[PDB]
Enzyme design. Structure first.
Site, mmCIF file in Angstrom:
data_model
loop_
_atom_site.group_PDB
_atom_site.id
_atom_site.type_symbol
_atom_site.label_atom_id
_atom_site.label_comp_id
_atom_site.label_asym_id
_atom_site.label_seq_id
_atom_site.Cartn_x
_atom_site.Cartn_y
_atom_site.Cartn_z
ATOM 1 C CG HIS B 479 -0.465 -0.392 2.505
ATOM 2 N ND1 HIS B 479 0.109 0.538 3.359
ATOM 3 C CD2 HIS B 479 -0.462 -1.576 3.167
ATOM 4 C CE1 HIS B 479 0.427 -0.060 4.490
ATOM 5 N NE2 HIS B 479 0.068 -1.341 4.400
ATOM 6 C CG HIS B 486 3.536 0.560 11.777
ATOM 7 N ND1 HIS B 486 3.255 -0.186 10.643
ATOM 8 C CD2 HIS B 486 3.915 -0.323 12.728
ATOM 9 C CE1 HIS B 486 3.522 -1.471 10.883
ATOM 10 N NE2 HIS B 486 3.892 -1.588 12.161
#
Ligand SMILES: [Ca+2]
Ligand SMILES: [Ca+2]
Ligand SMILES: [Ca+2]
Ligand code: NA
Ligand code: NA
Ligand code: NA
Ligand code: NA
Ligand code: NA
Ligand code: NA
Ligand code: NA
Ligand code: NA
Lengths: 597, 597, 99, 597, 50
Positions: B479, B486
């Site tokens: 992606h 994160h």
């Protein structure tokens, strides 16, 4: 013209989606909750007195007399008012704990132990959380748990018998339930329970449907101290997910190549790969044979809010869950959704496939799509944890606003006081006459066990005590028995996991804890277990763990499991309006049927 | 008559509450997201061609030519249509990976390694999750991240320089940043970055406010490779919450008595009490010095979807995070909210007080009320985890639907191809001419490092390679780079914890990892750290860990942190309508101001 | 004044009658439907396999092996997706019949 | 953010769909219905009297004088009030039938026949069904039929002339219209009608558009007694669907193999395969030459509600429709949608394809989808039948609430009474002077025919009678002439079949009934018929069958066909909102244009 | 040959069948189905005629 729908702005579509979810929840309708009738049934025995005694209601924290009955009925009636109001000042105005010393301000306890520690009071834990709304899932008050067993009922006699047998059996090792060394005690337990109407006679036509569903039959070594969710009664007592580790980082298939973790063996020694770090399945070891609240004065102090939290002693180190007590310790401190998050982490590390009715679960050469945020690991990791607080609100409503059932320790207190008085030809708490009459053999063992405890605790010549020994120094949490926070969360969380994973996947190798060492051994079980079965068993393990600690009865746990399942189902239904994809969750329910959501 | 309001049924009040939260979210309004203009700026260099090249867009998975440019612009344009549609068939119709062998059906890779493994393709990870609605918090599309740095910008040259220096510094121990054995490399890194306009010249009046906020100044050993959240730049590099354990079961204060756990020392050896079991802070050890995608053929295969996941090797055992690479490994596999749940577990085990503006936080003798479901441990444990997927939806919208920024590996690929061509008097990817011109010294070190890697990987005489070495065999996730899953989760989760706890609480003892052994040592730091500061530092640690792995740039992480904070704030605001109590969360924001919610 | 109802146009009365019938149907509420649990219960017996067999599900039309079990579980999973979607293209994309 | 729509619960989507259909029906708006003005035009001829006569209104059942005019105008005015109210008590309060005998309670009839049978009265058939709403389709009152022809009009003279010629032609066989033995009568009929202004002169600019559409031109043997729907005037008089059987069970193609039913010949002998059983096309045989209500006293009794239903005699057995009278018998008892259900069963048995604009009509190897519930046999079988009652409500509104047109028998009664009086130099019912003046030749033949009937019925020397002979003992049903229940149902049902089937399909072999035997023979027609044409012809056959029985006029039938088409179209339009698939019905309308719904 | 037991699904209880006899062999359980001839009159008899 050709019939059509129309687009609107994203922001309006988001609004309308959230309203449509609220409307779906509203359109489910609501059901009332019925209590068992005890709260105004039992009366103060004093002839000149027109008050209820509240003896079968949770009154932990309000000041009790020398028999364990509250001193002033207004203290409980005000508590009930505060529960339904939630107002902070009204809560602060309640009476909590016994009279205080004018000079020090400290509570004056009955027991030398509580006075020597100068204990303060602890307070009710969110006594009005049952009033809290939520942005998702069924409203806390929209659903119901059925009336709790009454003190005079065969069901309660059976439940309290079971809890005493668990208490006296706390040093039994799970791997040795069927072993010769335990045969005399295990057979005593089996025979005693089989001697009770609840277990030896079936429900009759006309009995409450909830009783029929939860009533248990013949007790056997294979079902002793187990739950009744499908899967719990097959194979080893403990779920694989509370003793096994997982596949470790470095074990992988990369195209045609298999790599093996240099730490692969950790899987079989109780290490869950937790990202790139680890969780150990090994539990802290409470001092074997040490129980609490076996002295009436200490018991009454605890009933009067004395804060004994943190008083336990432990051995060095940690081990895979070995004894009944160890499962009690496990559930003393577990963090909310811990058991189920840990199961989820094992399933993810081991590569167990997601529910194949979710999107994008095919090999990527076919679907060009892998999963993460939706329908993958991040999705389940959030969803399994988020259901917990919604399930807690619903069970809190049942605990405080509806049923206010006394915790097992309080029932043990009535039994002890009753029996002691009966030995002197006096009738106190006749409400528990049937339990006293039927559990003589068990109560005699409790008396001996309690005297030993009371001697260990420094009492040279203890009064006779038939109290239910507690695994925890403070006994139950500061909230009512029916239902259970642990069990409602178990029901909700395992519902999510069974739905999210392909829970028909069969377990490859079944383990148990070794009889001789702190390690895993291959089980000799020779059937098939499934992910769903083992997730149900995990829920039953955490729920019965509370019973084994002395803090819930069987009915609290099973009815809370059903409540939690309803909460999770409702969250999944409402969330289904948020996705564009064509999919559903297949959920095998606790009743054996499947719902597709 | 006296003005009043009126009661209605609980079910209607629940519905109206949920509608009022949706209306609050709607009334915030929405903002557009602006991309940096590169997608249609850069053109195919072939004279007889009117297509964009898409070279600065994420095109991982679409078939690339020998220079790393996509072969067919339609492949990217279809991918963009699929991202905005979400339709499963349209996604399945995209082109993923290179031409396949007619006989075996397998992709034909460029590299002998990918062919020998018979690797299959991996697919995009929820390329339309940015379309998903949510029952709570700001809608994914209602908020924005600002335009990403362009390839020709001083900011990008600075970012990519930093990532190469991190890659080449992967074996440096955090505890030894200022040690003589590392002085040559550390000073090289500092000097190189200080030689770049981004760091050595301030923003100018008129520059975008987002650039002004995230621009960094003079690089020092004290700020090298750190984030800019308040707290990150003070004291040791690693947050206490990613190396220390917690208080353990058996350590407790019971009235006037202090009990000490037999396992107390585990706190200082990286064990978090996790209910009645433990988490180990010790991370798996990726093979030191082994990096990936340093060969152009292997790099291009990865760009063409070759699934190298799981290919890394490890040393046996585990250690407290020691080197830059270890923080990369930590963030390779961490489970969603893991770092922040672990910090939460430390704060709970250590008894850190909740935010004193919540209800019921006084001693129970004063308020008659303890906390659990609301305003206590169960509440924070659910809230910290539930925000994660809401934050992910928002950053996924920015990743796929708005910005589609190329991952750092792809930028390194442009730089390598450019430099190699320039050495033969040819101009390829002039868009990165400035990076090539300014980063000569760093690229020469990368060339030497890559030659060694390529020799170790079995190529006796490798072509020169200036690729950015990846910590992970597969390089980035499937992606786009901007923003980061994160970092958005870090921003949302630490926002929750700062609000929920009393995050002005000061840290008592500060630890670091020992220079010589795998253990904690008291830090020589002399100032004061706070819970909030160390939570911010933890967010910056997880976020920069991605950068140190080679998979994000500085701007991706900082802008994602801000997006996650907005999501968590919005969830808190909407949830505030669900409670009857009088309270608020005090939240110290990343910008240094406080919001009361 | 004397309580009354009021007339409206025939067309509005017809509309209101049809809405009132829809409202009556809506006000009955709805109930879920529960399946017997077999669909994900029965598994492919091959040891190296983590698929359901779907042997107790209707799979007439999907390609079956020599024992009458479907060959590829994806064919039934796609069929289920098409059932819930109704889209004609998705239906036309299914696998029907043998090789 | 990207514009979107949103999901809601299925229950809300169902509700909203039903509301959207109601809204579509409401948004069509409504049109008024205009009557022809006669009801208050014609006055009681009594000089001292200010009442209408109602002679051109349906007054069957109210007590009539010896001329067939109602005795008391209040009886009709109350009947009109009851029609518009629908109240059961108000209906029960009306006057029905003549004075009754005090001793027996029985009606006292004029005729010896009715008195000897002791006949009771029959009542109006749902005189307020035009008030009934419906869950689907255009509301009964929202649409209109245009004003009926007036007694003084060329159109009415033409209509009534035609009905007398049909009555006197009842024994003519369809197969023999053009035969020498019938030439004198057939040419008389043709010449008489061609002698009338309606047929021999065209409409003029300025005439009502409804008259222009339905006006007929030159009468020929090829159009005699036919309808004007497209297809009715080509090929044999009777639709294939009312004389042919169908393919039989056992005839089929299985791959390359042809199976032949052992009863295949049944197809050509009038047997429709009806599931696994059969329908016979052979009709019961009313006694040839026996007509009814040819005596004024019996006629008046029937006008006064004498219940002659069931009085007919029949020959043994059954035959394919042979004579004009047989088509009258067919429509005397047919069950609602019977003709069209039977046509539908033929089309299904014969494998006629559905409309190719419906979904899933391709070979299953292409679309993976066969049809049944939607777009297949079960769908059309329900839809063709369900439209009938909706069409009936609409025509009942026109019959009773709007137009109240007298049935043809009543017009014949005015003509007979007028002519008889005129022969004695008295003027009675001058309203029908033009019909009397123009139809002398036809009325002379009716007189001769009626004398023979009256002699056969037992009157040796009957008074002259010019009454329109009825095929049925009771004459018309107990409801007004304009429009027709049979014709409105025909229009609605054949509209459904034309839309649902591929109604452009051509008929392969055309049959007729044999001149000499009770069997089918190949027609000598050269030309092509289509399913749509033959369905239109079927509608015209059932509709004109009522005319041939003496119970409707041409205009009743044609205007009713148009009304039924509108009902069916509206139902299809509203139902189109209920389906997810992309499709439409192609409907060739009666006006030659096509609507796609 | 064995009845449903208390606790069984109510749907099973309603549709469970007992002793098979020649009088109920292959029949349904709707009220009326088990009395008189196997076939409904309406699938073998004709009707009154015109
Ligand atoms: Ca996939
Ligand atoms: Ca407190
Ligand atoms: Ca087809
Ligand atoms: Na998995
Ligand atoms: Na499952
Ligand atoms: Na298996
Ligand atoms: Na170009
Ligand atoms: Na903890
Ligand atoms: Na703070
Ligand atoms: Na048929
Ligand atoms: Na057609």
């Amino acid at each position: 013209g050709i019939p059509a729908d129309n687009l609107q702005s994203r922001a309006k579509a988001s609004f309308d989606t959230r309203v449509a979810a609220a409307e779906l929840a509203l359109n489910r309708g609501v059901v009332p909750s019925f209590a068992n009738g005890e709260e105004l049934l039992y009366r103060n025995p004093d002839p000149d007195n027109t008050d209820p005694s509240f003896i079968a209601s949770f009154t932990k924290g309000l000041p009790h007399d020398d028999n364990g009955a509250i001193i002033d009925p207004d203290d409980f009636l005000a508590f009930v008012r505060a529960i339904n109001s939630g107002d902070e000042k009204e809560i602060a105005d309640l009476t909590l704990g016994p009279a205080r010393d004018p000079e020090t301000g400290l509570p004056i306890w009955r027991s030398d132990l509580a006075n020597s520690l100068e204990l303060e009071v602890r307070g009710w834990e969110n006594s009005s959380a049952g009033l809290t709304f939520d942005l998702e899932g069924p409203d806390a008050q929209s659903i119901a748990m059925p009336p709790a067993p009454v003190l005079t009922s065969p069901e309660l006699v059976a439940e309290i018998a079971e809890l005493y047998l668990m208490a006296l059996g706390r040093e039994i090792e799970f791997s040795e339930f069927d072993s010769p060394k335990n045969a005399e005690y295990i057979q005593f337990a089996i025979d005693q329970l089989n001697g009770l109407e609840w277990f030896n006679t079936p429900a009759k036509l006309g009995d409450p449907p909830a009783e029929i569903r939860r009533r248990r039959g013949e007790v056997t070594v294979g079902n002793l101290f187990r739950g009744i969710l499908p899967g719990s009664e097959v194979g080893p007592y403990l779920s694989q997910y509370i003793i096994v580790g997982s596949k470790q980082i470095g074990s992988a298939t990369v195209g045609n190549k298999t790599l093996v973790s240099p730490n692969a063996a950790d899987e079989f020694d109780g290490e869950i790969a937790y990202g790139s770090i680890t969780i150990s399945q090994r539990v802290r070891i409470a001092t074997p044979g040490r129980d609490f609240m076996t002295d009436l004065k200490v018991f009454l102090d605890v009933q009067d809010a004395a804060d004994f939290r943190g008083f336990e002693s432990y051995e060095p180190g940690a081990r895979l869950i070995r004894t009944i007590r160890d499962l009690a310790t496990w559930v003393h401190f577990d963090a909310l959704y811990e058991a189920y998050l840990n199961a989820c982490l094992i399933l993810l590390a081991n590569g167990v496939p997601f529910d194949p009715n979710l999107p994008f679960q095919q090999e990527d050469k076919l679907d060009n799509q892998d999963v993460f945020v939706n329908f993958g690991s991040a999705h389940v990791l959030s969803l399994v944890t988020e259901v917990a607080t919604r399930a807690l609100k619903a069970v809190w409503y049942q605990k405080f606003n509806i049923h206010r059932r006394l915790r097992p320790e309080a029932t043990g207190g009535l039994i002890s006081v009753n029996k002691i008085a009966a030995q002197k030809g006096e009738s106190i708490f006749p409400e528990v006459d049937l339990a006293v009459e039927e559990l003589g053999d068990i109560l005699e063992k409790a008396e001996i066990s309690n005297r030993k405890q009371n001697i260990a605790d420094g009492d040279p010549d203890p009064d006779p005590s038939f109290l239910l020994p507690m695994a925890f120094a403070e006994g139950s949490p500061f909230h009512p028995s029916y239902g259970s926070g642990h069990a409602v969360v178990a029901g909700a969380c395992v519902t999510i996991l069974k739905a999210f994973f392909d829970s028909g996947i069969e377990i490859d190798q079944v383990f148990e804890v070794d009889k001789d060492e702190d390690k895993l051994v291959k089980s000799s079980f020779k059937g098939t277990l499934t992910v769903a079965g083992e997730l149900n068993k995990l829920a039953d393990n955490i729920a019965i763990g509370r019973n084994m600690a002395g803090v819930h009865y069987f009915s609290d746990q099973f009815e809370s499991l059903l409540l939690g399942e309803q909460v999770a189902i409702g969250i999944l239904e409402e969330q289904s309006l948020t996705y564009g994809e064509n999919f559903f969750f297949n959920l095998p329910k606790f009743d054996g049927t499947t719902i597709q959501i």
